[PDB]
Design a protein around this nucleic acid. Structure first.
Ligand SMILES: CN[C@@H]1[C@@H](O)[C@@H](O[C@@H]2[C@@H](O)[C@H](O[C@H]3O[C@H]([C@@H](C)O)[C@@H](O)[C@H](O)[C@H]3N)[C@@H](N)C[C@H]2N)OC[C@]1(C)O
Ligand SMILES: CN[C@@H]1[C@@H](O)[C@@H](O[C@@H]2[C@@H](O)[C@H](O[C@H]3O[C@H]([C@@H](C)O)[C@@H](O)[C@H](O)[C@H]3N)[C@@H](N)C[C@H]2N)OC[C@]1(C)O
Ligand SMILES: CN[C@@H]1[C@@H](O)[C@@H](O[C@@H]2[C@@H](O)[C@H](O[C@H]3O[C@H]([C@@H](C)O)[C@@H](O)[C@H](O)[C@H]3N)[C@@H](N)C[C@H]2N)OC[C@]1(C)O
Ligand SMILES: CN[C@@H]1[C@@H](O)[C@@H](O[C@@H]2[C@@H](O)[C@H](O[C@H]3O[C@H]([C@@H](C)O)[C@@H](O)[C@H](O)[C@H]3N)[C@@H](N)C[C@H]2N)OC[C@]1(C)O
Ligand SMILES: CN[C@@H]1[C@@H](O)[C@@H](O[C@@H]2[C@@H](O)[C@H](O[C@H]3O[C@H]([C@@H](C)O)[C@@H](O)[C@H](O)[C@H]3N)[C@@H](N)C[C@H]2N)OC[C@]1(C)O
Ligand SMILES: CN[C@@H]1[C@@H](O)[C@@H](O[C@@H]2[C@@H](O)[C@H](O[C@H]3O[C@H]([C@@H](C)O)[C@@H](O)[C@H](O)[C@H]3N)[C@@H](N)C[C@H]2N)OC[C@]1(C)O
Ligand SMILES: [Zn+2]
Lengths: 159, 218, 105, 60
RNA sequence: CCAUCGACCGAUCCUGAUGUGUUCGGAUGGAUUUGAGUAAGAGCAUAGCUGUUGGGACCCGAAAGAUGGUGAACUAUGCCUG
RNA sequence: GGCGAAAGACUAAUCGAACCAUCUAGUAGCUGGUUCCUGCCGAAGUUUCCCUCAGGAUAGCAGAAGCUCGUAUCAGUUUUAUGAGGUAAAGCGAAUGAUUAGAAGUCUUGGGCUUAACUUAUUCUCAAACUUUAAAUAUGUAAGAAGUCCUUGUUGCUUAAUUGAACGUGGACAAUUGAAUGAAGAGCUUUUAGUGGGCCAUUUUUGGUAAGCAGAACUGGCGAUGCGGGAUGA
RNA sequence: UGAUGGUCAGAAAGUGAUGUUGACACAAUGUGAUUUCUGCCCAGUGCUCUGAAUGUCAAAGUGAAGAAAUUCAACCAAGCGCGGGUAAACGGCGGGAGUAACUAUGACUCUCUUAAGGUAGCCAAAUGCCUCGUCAUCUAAUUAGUGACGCGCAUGAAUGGAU
RNA sequence: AAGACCCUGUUGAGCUUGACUCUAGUUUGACAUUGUGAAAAGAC
RNA sequence: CCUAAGGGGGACUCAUGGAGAACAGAAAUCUCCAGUAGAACAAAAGGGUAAAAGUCCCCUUGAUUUUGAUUUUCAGUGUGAAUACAAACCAUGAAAGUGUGGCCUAUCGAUCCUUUAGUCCCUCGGAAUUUGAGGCUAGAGGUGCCAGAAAAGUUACCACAGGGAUAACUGGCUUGUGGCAGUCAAGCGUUCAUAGCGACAUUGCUUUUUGAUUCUUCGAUGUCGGCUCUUCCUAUCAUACCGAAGCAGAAUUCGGUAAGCGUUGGAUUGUUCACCCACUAAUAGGGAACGUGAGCUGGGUUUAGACCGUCGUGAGACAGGUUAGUUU
RNA sequence: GGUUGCGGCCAUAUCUAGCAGAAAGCACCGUUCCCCGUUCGAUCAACCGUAGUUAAGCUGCUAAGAGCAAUACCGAGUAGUGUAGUGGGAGACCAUACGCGAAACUAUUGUGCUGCAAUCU
RNA sequence: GCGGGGUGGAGCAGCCUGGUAGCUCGUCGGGCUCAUAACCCGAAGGUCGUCGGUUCAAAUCCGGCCCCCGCAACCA
RNA sequence: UACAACAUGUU
RNA sequence: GCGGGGUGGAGCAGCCUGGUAGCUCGUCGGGCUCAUAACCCGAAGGUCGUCGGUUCAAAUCCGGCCCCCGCAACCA
């Protein structure tokens, strides 16, 4: 019959990376997590305790609780026509800080610095990001760059 | 006892090889893949001619055996065994299945129909792409037409469409005729029986220089 | 399954409330009283005419029973019960395993 | 004789998108259920002391 | 009205003062526990639509089961008389 | 119950248990029917459990009634930033497994100049339950006022600590409040109908020689829908 | 079954049928004129008989403990179990190897095993699948008929055999 | 002629038995109907 | 399944191969070297693990107590399993630590009833004592159809509600199987592949076989064969005309246009089929709701009577045999 | 710059075969009364720093080295793939439009970087 | 769709429950007889059908294959 | 108690 | 529609899994006998039913042409 056990279908997702087996490098255990941090979930197959379910593998959430060896992460899961708030306890081997957040904090700092500069300088700076615009006009020289003509080539076999 | 080959022509299923999961698989009807003067030197047979598939289909092992016998027999009859080296370039690794429905009157009473219809191993076939080589024959340039005719006869033994292509290359090597001659004149090839070995400018210098004493460093 | 006859575990007796020595036996159910309410009700229902008035289980499926350990504290005589996983053979205080011995059949 | 359809997810996302799929609603203060009991115990005393200190400071 | 941290009442676990029918009493202070509770009442009554359950229960429909009676002018078998 | 030279025969056109009235409008997850108009909204054949499989309950989908507010923060979409994946392809002189052919060594390893094993460098061909590599589509999260910064309050938690943790007082930053596009507005509650046989098309895909066959995935449809076209046709 | 009875009826009864009866009778079954015959099996399922001999065994009764409800014990009817009979009761009635001076067959031998291993007869029969069996006869020609044969799917002895 | 075959229904009925649950009858024991004596084995 | 195969600590390194050492050899024990795991880790498979999760040694019982939070299955109910903490009490280690059974993914069970553990706490309602009984919290005894009735058959005497949600005809889709036709050419044919044939392969067609399916029909489309009668197809048996030959003649064989015209009489069988006899120019194959039952017939099939054999304790069963059975 | 102790990333660091290494450090090295552990002071434990040595460890250098890592008018805009048509083809399949886009192969280059503390011809 | 078996030359146990392959007949040696048979005293003979796995250990437990024997295959 | 048999044909 | 089977003059091995044709019954020579029968020892004896193919090599693998034993063989 059918089989729907806890770790079914995790043959590859929970394998260790190629030539990346064995002991956990200690930087994993030295990271500091605080309530409200955004973390990525990745099951480590060598640590069988405090593992995520396969659903939470590759998901990203908010830390809401910090214990001796683990953090509690909040995940939103779709069940039918709505999301359910899920709470998962994860040992820190299965968790990692998210990088986009550190970039966004960098932007907040830079934006405050620029606004303070403009304030103290007497001008105003526009601080919204913008998508790529169409290019403007331009003049192209032909010094050493005479346009070279290309033509479609005939069919050939190389057997 | 064999169903007509149209029942297993096309690659409708995922590959189903003999393995730990289907043990009781009969052997293929083809056993010999290298025919003629297979011990011949690379320099002896410069001309290479291919029978190339133009279909995405399954060729039975019986079809491969029939084509092999036909081509080998014709070329050996006309120019003797020593005039060529014929190689079958496809191996039947795909297991075919059959449901084995009784073909008498009253069978509805006994057999179960489509219930539990997973079939038993039935035969072996090779899965071929479009543009894949089916048979290759290296020979002397003077034996071109006889080999082409031999491959022409063997074509009728296969389903679908196939072409006979004369290759620009020297024998079974991956070099054009001119490239093989240029390597040969620079002393970068030695015979390894039916095949050859090429010079690499990488690795232990002294070993490479021993291996190819005629090499002309330029 | 081989379980020793003594086991140092927590005692809930208010005189101990700590790990004490316990003596381990196997639980055995007492005899069915003829004066329990359920049995007095059953006998009254069965009397007279009507035949069998309640279901009698038939479709046995299990081949084992969960062994219950009876742990009696050697200090205050407080009892504790402890269930084990299903097992076909159970004994108390059997000869412990010794490996590296030439088996002597 | 009674063989019928076993399972399908056809039309299921269409039903889910009629009134969903609604995100859960966020609040300034989250429930401290499931939070470590030792932290929650001391957080009670910290909030209580802050209220007293602010009430005293507002008094004077 | 909502989110959140507390406080009060009952159940559960712990602590255990002054005192005593010396085995009762239960001050006091604690516990990731628990309740259909408190924390300036909201209910009762009548009526209406819709929904629910029991009723013949939207209407008509079994094959059956039971209680009490009527038939041997047909027919089966015995008997009596032709 | 009778009666039976026995057919389950006969017992008033009634017999594998007569006729008559009553219980009795017996029960039916089953078949049939179910009576005026217009207006607005408008489904489901799916989840879980059930002696459940022609039936229910449960969630979903639908209607009604509203209530608290009035642009708050929302989206079957993109952008920027940042994760996860082992399918397509590919590979096998890379591990595992399969597999064609010679060549050179070792005879120390077995039959008789060498058939065979073994080793070394090569060579042809493969994998749903192999793999170093590895897409496209799909997929998680973020893009601030519940934010950032400065100073210092609470605590029974934490630190060797005046270290922290969480929540704060006071002060600073105000419309570019920190991407786009849109937004008959957002949020909240009660209650109840029908439904719980589906089917089709492109693509992916399993069993089968195949099927207008049987079974899955995403989407769009038919069912519930007329209209123009495909003569005709869900 | 010898009447204080057998078989049967009735809700009961000072109630009935056989019975105006008595084993050359009544009651209950099976087979189915005559002729010639009815083989072996009592392990199973029944039916029946013995109990001086006895494990289990109800209520009542007996003993002991207890304040008592009650508990425990011993004893203990028929039945069951134990033992004998019974097939014109229901029914049943075998395999595997070798072996004769052409070959073939197997009178003969060994072994396994049963309660007993299908006897006398009969047969492709209204009972034989294979099967339109094989041979003969009948016809120009016969899946029909008849006579033979018989390792007979799966014939057979009052579940009566052969006439 | 609301298929008589087939299937479904938590619809029946006739029949059978080592099905489940009972039952008329029958048999066995105790007590009551049930009194009056004798002999011999037993127990207080 | 396991008192360790659970928990902690320590030390060590496995499979395999090479070279050596009396008996001793391919396999006994010792030594060194290589050895990314090719070993081991109870049990399926997958994942995981090397100063270890493996092996050996030492100490132990955390496989403990109290109830909450969370994950999977999910209705975000139950059950099973699992995760991270709080408050205790312990084990181990120098210590940091680790430990709430088994390295992870399976290894399991409600109400009612009985039984046991715990406070020895609550109740027996006129008041008490002591027995007895009943409660509160936590386990056990079990439902494997595993969200959990207490359950043997037969109907060929049969009934009812339904079902074309579903079998037994035709028809439709398909064409494995059946039937028919091509391509190639190894061989046969005195030599000669192709007059006539044709292996190994391979492409099709047909719906005259049988399956597969279950779309239509269960408020009924009369369900075998024969007889009778008409017509159609061509893949042509005969008859007309012709091309080919391993065509001397005769006979025969291969092929074309051709369905205009014919294609029989009998023995056995219910038979379609089969098989003989005989005639004939020839005794071709098929379709038309497997043409044709308000056209017949009724031998068969397929109600109820009856017999036999095998099976069943029995009622009865049997694509086993047999005999009799209303055709509007 | 060398070296040591503790590390981070965890082969550009590994592996094979040669060579060289001043000072300091590290190391090999001597010994067994004591704590301690062994069949064995080999490992482990202690003691001396005294008697010896850069032989080995370790470090660096070399090799058209193996492995690893990185780059590219390398292959290749190829394989594959999202969207579209009453496109082509009997069909298997193929092209085009708007997009994304590998791996093998080929060539070239490189062979640890680094934090804290101490120390040195 | 199945259920039972394969063991010295032959027919049969041991399998259930892993540690030594047992019984009758048969074969071989010697004796007894003029010789045979009977009889008497002694001895050999199956790695358990095969290919594997599990186990400390397999005839024994499990899987695949080969040979043998039979059961069942119904409603139209 | 137990005791079966002795190939063909002559001179 | 067909499993399967064709080996000395005969009954059987040898195939499976290509390299090599054995035994029994019988035939002919001898031993033995007075001569036989029996018995014992020797020896001849199958190009694998026929043809074609695969292969370095065919009794063996594949397919044709002969012979044989057996089985599948409308329906309602
Ligand atoms: C004894 N420990 C208490 C802990 O139990 C808790 O107290 C709860 C309290 O939170 C509950 O109260 C809770 O539930 C009630 C509702 C049931 O009426 C609500 O009104 C209330 O808002 C809610 N907090 C109250 N019902 C019981 C206390 N013991 O409060 C924290 C605590 C002090 O540690
Ligand atoms: C103005 N004083 C108010 C007093 O009126 C009262 O307010 C209650 C409030 O506590 C209740 O709310 C409470 O209980 C609800 C309940 C649904 O469980 C929960 O939200 C939660 O436990 C708690 N906030 C709310 N439901 C009604 C107000 N009148 O509670 C105390 C108070 C907050 O101080
Ligand atoms: C690159 N991969 C392609 C993938 O893109 C897709 O191709 C579709 C193709 O199948 C569609 O074509 C399809 O549908 C059309 C019609 C019904 O629309 C049919 O005519 C056609 O037969 C059918 N193959 C074509 N119209 C668009 C392509 N993108 O499906 C086929 C594929 C090979 O997987
Ligand atoms: C000596 N005084 C005691 C006091 O110590 C305390 O005792 C508790 C007692 O209440 C608990 O007792 C509890 O027992 C059960 C339980 C299911 O709730 C109930 O029936 C009972 O009413 C309840 N009190 C007991 N389990 C522990 C004692 N230490 O409470 C009761 C008391 C009489 O006040
Ligand atoms: C009139 N008597 C006829 C008698 O002549 C004969 O008829 C056959 C007939 O049955 C044959 O036909 C038969 O056999 C052919 C087969 C030979 O191809 C089959 O195709 C056909 O279906 C079959 N009916 C037919 N080919 C010739 C007539 N003489 O056999 C049948 C019969 C009834 O006895
Ligand atoms: C009766 N005893 C016989 C003894 O006579 C002998 O028999 C051979 C027998 O083997 C020979 O048999 C052999 O003969 C030759 C072989 C010698 O190469 C073969 O060609 C032949 O095929 C083979 N049958 C036969 N030709 C003669 C007998 N006497 O060897 C066998 C034996 C059993 O011991
Ligand atoms: Zn205690």
């Amino acid at each position: 019959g059918k089989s729907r056990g806890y770790r079914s279908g995790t043959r590859y997702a929970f394998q260790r990376d190629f030539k990346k087996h064995g002991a956990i490098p200690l930087s994993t255990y030295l990271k500091v997590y605080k309530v409200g941090d955004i973390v990525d979930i990745k099951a480590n197959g060598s640590i069988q305790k405090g593992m995520p379910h396969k659903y939470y593998h590759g998901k990203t959430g908010i830390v809401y609780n910090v214990t001796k060896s683990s953090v509690g992460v909040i995940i939103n899961k779709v069940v039918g026509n709505r999301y359910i708030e899920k709470r998962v306890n994860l040992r820190v081997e299965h968790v990692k800080h998210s990088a986009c957040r550190q970039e966004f904090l960098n932007r907040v700092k830079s934006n405050a610095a620029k606004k303070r500069e403009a304030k103290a300088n007497g001008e105003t700076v526009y601080l919204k990001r913008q998508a790529a615009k169409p290019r403007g006009s331009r003049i192209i020289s032909t010094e050493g760059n005479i346009p070279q003509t290309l033509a479609p080539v005939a069919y050939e076999t190389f057997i | 006892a064999r169903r007509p080959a149209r029942c297993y022509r096309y690659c409708k299923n995922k590959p189903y090889p003999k393995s730990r999961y289907n043990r009781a698989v009969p052997d293929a009807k083809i056993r010999i893949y290298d025919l003629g003067r297979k011990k011949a030197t690379v320099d002896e047979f410069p001309l290479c001619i291919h029978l190339v598939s133009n279909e995405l289909e399954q060729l039975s092992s019986e079809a491969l055996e029939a084509a092999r016998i036909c081509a080998n027999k014709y070329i050996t009859k006309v120019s003797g065994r020593d005039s060529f080296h014929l190689r079958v370039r496809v191996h039947p690794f795909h297991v075919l299945r059959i449901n084995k429905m009784l073909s008498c009157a009253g069978a509805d009473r006994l057999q179960q129909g489509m219930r539990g219809a997973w079939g038993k191993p039935h035969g072996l076939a090779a899965r071929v792409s479009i543009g894949q080589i089916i048979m290759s024959a290296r020979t002397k340039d003077s034996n071109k037409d006889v080999v082409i005719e031999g491959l022409r006869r063997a074509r009728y033994k296969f389903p679908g469409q196939q072409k006979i292509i004369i290759s620009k290359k020297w024998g079974f090597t991956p070099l054009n005729r001119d490239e093989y001659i240029a390597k040969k004149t620079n002393g970068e090839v030695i015979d390894d029986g039916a095949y050859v070995k090429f010079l690499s400018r990488k690795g232990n210098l002294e070993a490479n220089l021993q291996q190819f004493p005629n090499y002309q460093y330029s | 399954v081989n379980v020793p006859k003594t086991r140092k575990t927590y005692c809930k007796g208010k005189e101990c409330r700590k790990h004490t020595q316990h003596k381990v036996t196997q639980y055995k159910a007492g005899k069915a009283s003829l004066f329990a309410q359920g049995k007095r009700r059953y006998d009254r229902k069965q009397s007279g005419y009507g035949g069998q008035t309640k279901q009698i289980f038939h479709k046995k499926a299990k081949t084992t029973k969960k062994v219950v350990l009876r742990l009696e504290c050697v200090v205050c005589k407080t009892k504790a019960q402890l269930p084990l996983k299903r097992c076909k053979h159970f004994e108390l205080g059997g000869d412990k395993k010794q490996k590296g011995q030439a088996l002597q059949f | 004789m009674a063989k019928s359809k076993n399972h399908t997810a056809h039309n299921q996302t269409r039903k889910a998108h009629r009134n969903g799929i609604k995100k859960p609603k966020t609040y300034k203060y989250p429930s401290l259920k499931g939070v470590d009991a030792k932290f929650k115990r001391n957080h009670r005393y910290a909030l209580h002391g802050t209220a007293k200190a602010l009430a005293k400071a507002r008094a004077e």
